[PDB]
C-alpha cells in the first residue's frame, strides 16, 4: 500500500483538484469499485459515473475552494484523514464547511473508500 | 442519553479532550462503552473492553506530562459519529503529535468504537 508520506500527498493533492474544480482528475483518483459516504451517514454511492455525478453536482458551479485546515494524519495501513474547510455560496449567503474526510487507499494508490464527517452544526454564514 | 445527536457528539467529544489534558483515566474509561473498542494507532490491533482500554490508558498518560487540545471543531454526523483534530504534547525533547480520532457512540450515549489515525509523519520534535 502506499506509504504513510505517500498519503499525505496523495490527501493534500485531492484538496487542490477540489479546490481547482477537476472533477476529472479528482474521478480517475478513485478505484473502480470506489465507495463515497459523504455525508457520513448516507448511504453510499458507488461507481465512477456515480461518483463523477456527484462532484459535478458538487463542484459544478464553480464558487468552492477548499484548503487544509492542519497536517494530514496518516497510518501505515494505507489509510489516512485530513481536517479543511470548504468555501460556498448558497442563495447569494457566502458559507464555510468544516469536515473531516477519512480515506483508505489500495495497492495502486487509488482511493478506495472516502468518509465525509460533517453536519449542520459545521456550517458558518459569512 | 439516547444515541447523541450531532450537538452532543460535538460535546461528548470536546469532554474526552479534556479528560485526556487532565489525566482522569478513571473518567475516560468511563466514558466508553463496557465492550468498546479502541484502534491507536489505527492498523494496529483493536484492544478489546473497558480493562483492556484502562490498561492502555494507563500507561499512555500515568507517566504524566502529557496535554491535549483541540486544534479545530469536532466533525459530528447524524448517525451518532464524529471525528476531531487535535494536539498532543509531551516530553528527551519537548514535541508534539498531531492526531484526528474518529468515534461512533451507542444507544446510551458511550463511545462504542474509537478510531487514531497518526503515525510517525505527524510526529514534531522541537
Ligand atoms: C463534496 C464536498 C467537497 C469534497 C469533499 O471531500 C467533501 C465534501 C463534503 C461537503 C460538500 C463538499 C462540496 C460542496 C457541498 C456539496 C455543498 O455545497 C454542501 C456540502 C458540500
Ligand atoms: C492515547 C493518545 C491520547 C488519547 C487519544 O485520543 C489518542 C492518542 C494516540 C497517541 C498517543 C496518545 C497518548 C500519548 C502517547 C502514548 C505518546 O506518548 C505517543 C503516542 C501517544
Ligand atoms: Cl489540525
Ligand atoms: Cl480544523
Ligand atoms: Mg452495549
Redesign the interface.
Known sequence: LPT??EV?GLMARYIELVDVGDIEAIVQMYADDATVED???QPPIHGREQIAAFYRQGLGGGKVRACL???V?????G?????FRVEMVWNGQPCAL???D?MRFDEHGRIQTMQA??????LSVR
Open positions: 504513510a508520506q499525505q455525508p457520513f451517514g485546515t492542519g497536517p494524519r496518516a497510518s501505515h495501513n489509510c489516512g484523514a485530513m481536517p468544516d469536515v473531516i477519512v464527517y460533517w453536519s449542520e452544526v459545521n
